[PDB]
Design an enzyme around this catalytic site. Structure first.
Site, PDB file in Angstrom:
ATOM      1  N   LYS A  13       0.850  -1.226   0.000  1.00 13.77           N
ATOM      2  CA  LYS A  13       0.000   0.000   0.000  1.00 13.77           C
ATOM      3  C   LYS A  13       0.857   1.235   0.000  1.00 13.77           C
ATOM      4  CE  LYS A  13      -2.320  -1.300   3.916  1.00 13.77           C
ATOM      5  NZ  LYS A  13      -1.621  -2.561   4.183  1.00 13.77           N
ATOM      6  N   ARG A  88     -10.285   0.118   7.730  1.00 10.08           N
ATOM      7  CA  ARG A  88      -9.912  -1.236   8.055  1.00 10.08           C
ATOM      8  C   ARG A  88     -11.000  -2.018   8.773  1.00 10.08           C
ATOM      9  NH1 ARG A  88      -3.644  -2.222   8.574  1.00 10.08           N
ATOM     10  NH2 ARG A  88      -3.023  -0.164   7.727  1.00 10.08           N
ATOM     11  N   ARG A 127      11.827  -5.867   5.735  1.00 10.97           N
ATOM     12  CA  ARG A 127      11.813  -4.478   5.383  1.00 10.97           C
ATOM     13  C   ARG A 127      12.773  -3.698   6.294  1.00 10.97           C
ATOM     14  NH1 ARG A 127       6.642  -1.151   5.610  1.00 10.97           N
ATOM     15  NH2 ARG A 127       6.289  -2.514   7.424  1.00 10.97           N
ATOM     16  N   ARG A 160      11.169  -1.690  11.833  1.00  4.32           N
ATOM     17  CA  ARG A 160      10.039  -1.248  12.696  1.00  4.32           C
ATOM     18  C   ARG A 160       9.792  -2.268  13.802  1.00  4.32           C
ATOM     19  NH1 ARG A 160       5.075   0.173   8.551  1.00  4.32           N
ATOM     20  NH2 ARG A 160       6.057   2.038   7.665  1.00  4.32           N
ATOM     21  N   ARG A 171      -0.665  -9.303  13.337  1.00  4.10           N
ATOM     22  CA  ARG A 171      -1.160  -8.346  12.365  1.00  4.10           C
ATOM     23  C   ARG A 171      -1.884  -8.992  11.208  1.00  4.10           C
ATOM     24  NH1 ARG A 171       4.065  -5.202  11.039  1.00  4.10           N
ATOM     25  NH2 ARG A 171       2.778  -4.001   9.597  1.00  4.10           N
TER      26      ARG A 171
HETATM   27  N1  LIG Z   1       5.737  -5.355  -5.704  1.00  3.01           N
HETATM   28  C1  LIG Z   1       6.598  -5.641  -4.749  1.00  3.01           C
HETATM   29  N2  LIG Z   1       7.405  -6.710  -4.857  1.00  3.01           N
HETATM   30  C2  LIG Z   1       8.230  -6.959  -3.824  1.00  3.01           C
HETATM   31  N3  LIG Z   1       8.376  -6.302  -2.661  1.00  3.01           N
HETATM   32  C3  LIG Z   1       7.547  -5.241  -2.473  1.00  3.01           C
HETATM   33  C4  LIG Z   1       6.567  -4.870  -3.494  1.00  3.01           C
HETATM   34  N4  LIG Z   1       5.886  -3.818  -3.040  1.00  3.01           N
HETATM   35  C5  LIG Z   1       6.388  -3.587  -1.788  1.00  3.01           C
HETATM   36  N5  LIG Z   1       7.371  -4.456  -1.435  1.00  3.01           N
HETATM   37  C6  LIG Z   1       8.155  -4.484  -0.224  1.00  3.01           C
HETATM   38  O1  LIG Z   1       7.395  -4.978   0.853  1.00  3.01           O
HETATM   39  C7  LIG Z   1       7.615  -4.197   2.035  1.00  3.01           C
HETATM   40  C8  LIG Z   1       6.233  -3.704   2.500  1.00  3.01           C
HETATM   41  O2  LIG Z   1       5.767  -2.695   1.560  1.00  3.01           O
HETATM   42  P1  LIG Z   1       4.931  -1.460   2.074  1.00  3.01           P
HETATM   43  O3  LIG Z   1       4.577  -0.757   0.825  1.00  3.01           O
HETATM   44  O4  LIG Z   1       5.536  -0.765   3.205  1.00  3.01           O
HETATM   45  O5  LIG Z   1       3.571  -2.236   2.503  1.00  3.01           O
HETATM   46  P2  LIG Z   1       2.328  -1.779   3.286  1.00  3.01           P
HETATM   47  O6  LIG Z   1       1.210  -2.529   2.689  1.00  3.01           O
HETATM   48  O7  LIG Z   1       2.317  -0.257   3.382  1.00  3.01           O
HETATM   49  O8  LIG Z   1       2.648  -2.380   4.721  1.00  3.01           O
HETATM   50  P3  LIG Z   1       2.794  -1.820   6.233  1.00  3.01           P
HETATM   51  O9  LIG Z   1       3.604  -2.627   7.156  1.00  3.01           O
HETATM   52  O10 LIG Z   1       2.992  -0.332   6.233  1.00  3.01           O
HETATM   53  O11 LIG Z   1       1.411  -2.362   6.518  1.00  3.01           O
HETATM   54  P4  LIG Z   1       0.367  -2.103   7.665  1.00  3.01           P
HETATM   55  O12 LIG Z   1      -0.943  -1.862   6.980  1.00  3.01           O
HETATM   56  O13 LIG Z   1       0.447  -3.377   8.454  1.00  3.01           O
HETATM   57  O14 LIG Z   1       1.001  -0.933   8.599  1.00  3.01           O
HETATM   58  P5  LIG Z   1       0.542   0.567   8.820  1.00  3.01           P
HETATM   59  O15 LIG Z   1       1.799   1.269   9.105  1.00  3.01           O
HETATM   60  O16 LIG Z   1      -0.484   1.053   7.877  1.00  3.01           O
HETATM   61  O17 LIG Z   1      -0.385   0.396  10.153  1.00  3.01           O
HETATM   62  C9  LIG Z   1       0.324   0.399  11.368  1.00  3.01           C
HETATM   63  C10 LIG Z   1      -0.635   0.093  12.520  1.00  3.01           C
HETATM   64  O18 LIG Z   1      -1.413   1.242  12.658  1.00  3.01           O
HETATM   65  C11 LIG Z   1      -2.723   0.925  13.128  1.00  3.01           C
HETATM   66  N6  LIG Z   1      -3.679   1.282  12.058  1.00  3.01           N
HETATM   67  C12 LIG Z   1      -3.412   1.804  10.854  1.00  3.01           C
HETATM   68  N7  LIG Z   1      -4.489   2.057  10.178  1.00  3.01           N
HETATM   69  C13 LIG Z   1      -5.551   1.760  10.985  1.00  3.01           C
HETATM   70  C14 LIG Z   1      -7.032   1.805  10.831  1.00  3.01           C
HETATM   71  N8  LIG Z   1      -7.586   2.249   9.674  1.00  3.01           N
HETATM   72  N9  LIG Z   1      -7.710   1.416  11.880  1.00  3.01           N
HETATM   73  C15 LIG Z   1      -7.129   0.899  13.003  1.00  3.01           C
HETATM   74  N10 LIG Z   1      -5.816   0.877  13.249  1.00  3.01           N
HETATM   75  C16 LIG Z   1      -5.008   1.262  12.210  1.00  3.01           C
HETATM   76  C17 LIG Z   1      -2.694  -0.576  13.345  1.00  3.01           C
HETATM   77  O19 LIG Z   1      -2.287  -0.906  14.682  1.00  3.01           O
HETATM   78  C18 LIG Z   1      -1.646  -1.014  12.340  1.00  3.01           C
HETATM   79  O20 LIG Z   1      -1.119  -2.348  12.573  1.00  3.01           O
HETATM   80  C19 LIG Z   1       8.689  -3.156   1.697  1.00  3.01           C
HETATM   81  O21 LIG Z   1       9.984  -3.709   2.132  1.00  3.01           O
HETATM   82  C20 LIG Z   1       8.519  -3.050   0.206  1.00  3.01           C
HETATM   83  O22 LIG Z   1       9.735  -2.579  -0.398  1.00  3.01           O
HETATM   84 MG   LIG Z   2       2.355   1.433   4.968  1.00  2.00          MG
END
Ligand SMILES: Nc1ncnc2c1ncn2[C@@H]1O[C@H](COP(=O)(O)OP(=O)(O)OP(=O)(O)OP(=O)(O)OP(=O)(O)OC[C@H]2O[C@@H](n3cnc4c(N)ncnc43)[C@H](O)[C@@H]2O)[C@@H](O)[C@H]1O
Ligand SMILES: [Mg+2]
Ligand SMILES: [Ca+2]
Ligand SMILES: [Zn+2]
Length: 215
Positions: A13, A88, A127, A160, A171
């Site tokens: 994402k 979410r 990552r 992280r 997660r």
């Molecule tokens: N095509 C490809 N091929 C190969 N490799 C690739 C690729 N594309 C990417 N990659 C690689 O893969 C890796 C991941 O890519 P990356 O692009 O960083 O993936 P991502 O989907 O953004 O993953 P996140 O870890 O950021 O996901 P998340 O949704 O769990 O965390 P967030 O910070 O939003 O959420 C954090 C926390 O916040 C809270 N939270 C956030 N939003 C909410 C909500 N709406 N409601 C409730 N709590 C929430 C929760 O506690 C949550 O766990 C990188 O190394 C990248 O280079």
């Molecule tokens: Mg993200």
């Protein structure tokens, strides 16, 4: 260009959001990034979010809906916006629908980026992020020239806190349980589009551009 990016943890994402925001000039609204920035500076949003984020749980609905409401109300969202990782829960989805209907808007697409769980686990545990510039690397999939060090600036890379295997597993569980109903909610509106996230980053983006260029 009123778009949501939806996907399990690790699906790409943030990777695709950066591309969409770069190309189309619409704001990047990532609840995860907003929580993480707040936690780093220890603001009261950060303190309240932290326990949930550390545990791999969802931050409660009201809080989350609140930061998104505040964000959407800014003048940079008049032409479109990219919501990354929100909603979410179905409660967040219904809240958003209400906010947008008052703003005289509707979501144009909800893009579900699909990746198998074994590769998600590998994406998250491998990552690494530059402490200087924020550039993302991956141990196997896009490694720096010198392990642990950013190619651009020599800064030391970090992991992280929630990317350890135990917390990744939690997660994935937590988010997978929310997912079928959220997909259904958007599929019933017929705004859901599924994209295969196992492609390379540009080919995923090319599949997104094939629909987004219509907006
Ligand atoms: N095509 C490809 N091929 C190969 N490799 C690739 C690729 N594309 C990417 N990659 C690689 O893969 C890796 C991941 O890519 P990356 O692009 O960083 O993936 P991502 O989907 O953004 O993953 P996140 O870890 O950021 O996901 P998340 O949704 O769990 O965390 P967030 O910070 O939003 O959420 C954090 C926390 O916040 C809270 N939270 C956030 N939003 C909410 C909500 N709406 N409601 C409730 N709590 C929430 C929760 O506690 C949550 O766990 C990188 O190394 C990248 O280079
Ligand atoms: Mg993200
Ligand atoms: Ca691949
Ligand atoms: Zn760097």
């Amino acid at each position: 260009m009123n778009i949501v990016l939806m996907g399990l943890p690790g699906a790409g994402k943030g990777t695709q959001a950066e591309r969409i925001v770069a190309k189309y000039g619409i704001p990047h609204i990532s609840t995860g990034d907003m929580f993480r920035a707040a936690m780093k500076e220890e603001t009261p949003l950060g303190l309240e979010a932290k326990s949930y984020i550390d545990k791999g749980e969802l931050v409660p609905d009201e809080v989350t809906i609140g930061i998104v409401r505040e964000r959407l109300s800014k003048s940079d969202c008049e032409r479109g916006f990219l919501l990354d990782g929100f909603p979410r829960t179905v409660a967040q989805a219904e809240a958003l629908e209400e906010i947008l209907e008052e703003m005289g808007r509707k979501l144009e697409y909800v893009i579900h980026i699909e990746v198998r769980q074994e590769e998600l686990m590998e994406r998250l545990t491998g990552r690494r992020i530059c402490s200087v510039c924020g550039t993302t690397y991956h141990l196997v999939f896009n490694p720096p020239k010198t392990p642990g060090i950013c190619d651009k600036d020599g800064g030391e890379l970090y992991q992280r806190a929630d990317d350890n295997e135990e917390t990744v597993a939690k997660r994935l569980e937590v988010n997978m349980k929310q997912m079928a109903p959220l997909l259904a909610f958007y599929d019933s509106k017929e705004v859901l589009v599924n994209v295969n996230g196992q492609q390379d980053m540009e080919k995923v983006f090319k599949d997104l551009r094939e629909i987004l260029q219509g907006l």
